[PDB]
Amino acid sequence: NEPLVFMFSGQGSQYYHMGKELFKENTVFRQSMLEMDAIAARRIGTSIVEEIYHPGKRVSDPFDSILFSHPAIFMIEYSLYKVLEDRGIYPDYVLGSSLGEFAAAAVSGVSDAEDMLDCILEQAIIIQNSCDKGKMLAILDKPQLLNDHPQLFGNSELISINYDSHFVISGEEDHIRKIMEDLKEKQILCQLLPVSYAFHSSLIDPAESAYAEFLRSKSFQKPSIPIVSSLTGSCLHVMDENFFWNAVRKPMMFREAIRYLESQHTCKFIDLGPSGTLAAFVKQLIPGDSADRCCSIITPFHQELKNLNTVEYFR
């Protein structure tokens, strides 16, 4: 019947204590986290898992330390994929967005989890050593505002339009805070994402050459599981050299990715990213009555096990 799309979100969807119910009550998930945590701890110096589940942090504290959040998103997503795999729920497509394209690539077979995690760690390290900090801002309003009132958003770059009432911009800290001030005087609602770098913008360009060089030391396979990419807006069969850089540097075309899938099939969408961000977007992008073709798992309601039971009816 209709294919299962596993979707992976990127920077800005992470939060403290994400997936704690699975880390404690699901052996496949916990073992996968622990295995990757040992790899990551070597390169960072400390445990990622102990930062994700930091008992002094709440969900509402921004998890914006790039050395921890970059690997944390991948580890969370790949471990949940193992959970689904263990339960015999297999993807017909993977769909990555931002850093989620790494998890998509790893699940596809482009690289194994250990190498992908390494690529993510190096990117985080290189960005931290080379780039000024910055911010990413969600605008809870119409992207048409970018055309009618471009001055409102000066000194920022559009990184994503997610549906007809949600887009995201990226820029320097003070520039973004001034846009926020200006939006408030226009009654335009916005929300800072929990990141400390203007990802998907030219303000991480200082990291490019170092990361390009690092990528030349790696070898990747062709996709095995079909990939749909937010970076390209379509199916991805052949990957160029800079894909894993553009996964963090280029703007997203998530709506084009979903449109492409919906043109071919009536898919079921499973958001394997923290917060269920992509599932929320997809529900806005597909006919209302089709909202039960879409579900998420890891959300701050910490109901991952109930949600995995829901996923079983997609089988």
Among 64, 75, 137, smallest CA distance to 102 is for 75
With a CB cutoff of 8 Å and minimum separation 6, the contacts of 145 are 139, 152, 153, 188
Q: Which residues contact 2 (CB under 8 A, 6 or more apart)?
A: 265, 266, 267, 268
Return the number of the residue (266 or 309) whose C-beta is nearest a second copy. 266
- Piece of 18-26, 64-72, 235-243, 285-293 that binds a second copy (CB under 8 A): 235-243
Cβ atoms of residues 247 and 96 within 8 Å? yes
Q: Is 232 in the site for a second copy (CB under 8 A)?
A: yes
Helices (H), the chain: 20-25, 27-44, 48-52, 66-86, 100-108, 113-130, 145-148, 173-185, 208-216, 243-249, 254-264, 277-285, 304-312
Is 216 near a second copy (CB under 8 A)? no
Applying CB under 8 A, among 56, 240, 288, 313 the residue interacting with a second copy is 240
Residue nearest to Zn ion (CB): 235
Residue 60 known to be catalytic? no
Min. distance of Cβ 230 from a second copy in angstroms? Answer: 14
Q: Which x/- pattern over 51-90 shows residues binding a second copy (rule: CB under 8 A)?
A: ----------------------------------------
Q: Measuring CA to CA, which residue among 67, 64, 72 is closest to residue 103? A: 72
Determine if 237 is a binding residue for a second copy (CB under 8 A): yes
Pick the binder of a second copy from 88, 147, 216, 238 (CB under 8 A): 238
Pick the binder of a second copy from 43, 226, 280, 310 (CB under 8 A). 226
Residue choice 133, 235, 284, 300 for contact with Zn ion (CB under 5 A): 235
Which are the contacts of 263, defined by CB distance < 8 A and separation ≥ 6? none
Enumerate residues 6+ apart whose C-beta is below 8 A from 135. Answer: 170, 171, 172, 173, 176, 177, 192, 193, 195, 196, 198
Q: Show the tokens assigned to 106.
A: 């790893």
Rule CB under 8 A: choose which of 264, 287, 305, 306 binds a second copy: 264
From 40-48, 136-144, 147-155, 236-244, give the range in contact with a second copy by CB under 8 A.
Answer: 236-244
Contacting residue, 1, 60, 147, 151, with a second copy by CB under 8 A: 1
Catalytic residue chosen out of the listed positions 98, 160, 230, 296: 98
Residue 241 in contact with a second copy, rule: CB under 8 A: yes
Query: Minimum Å distance from CB 290 to a second copy?
Result: 17
Query: Taking CB under 5 A as the rule, does residue 225 contact Zn ion?
Result: no
Fill in the DSSP letter of residue 237.
S
Task: Check binding of 219 to a second copy (CB under 8 A).
Answer: no
Q: Which of 259, 234, 229, 252 is nearest to 160 (CA)?
A: 252
From the list Zn ion, a second copy, none, pick the one residue 216 interacts with, judged by a Cβ distance below 5 to 8 Å according to partner type. Answer: none
Q: Which of 78, 134, 69, 131 is nearest to 103 (CA)?
A: 78
What is the DSSP-derived secondary structure letter of residue 25?
A: H
By CB under 8 A, name the binding residues for a second copy: 1, 3, 92-93, 226, 232, 234-238, 240-241, 260, 264-265
Give me the active site residues, please: 98
By CB under 5 A, name the binding residues for Zn ion: 226, 235
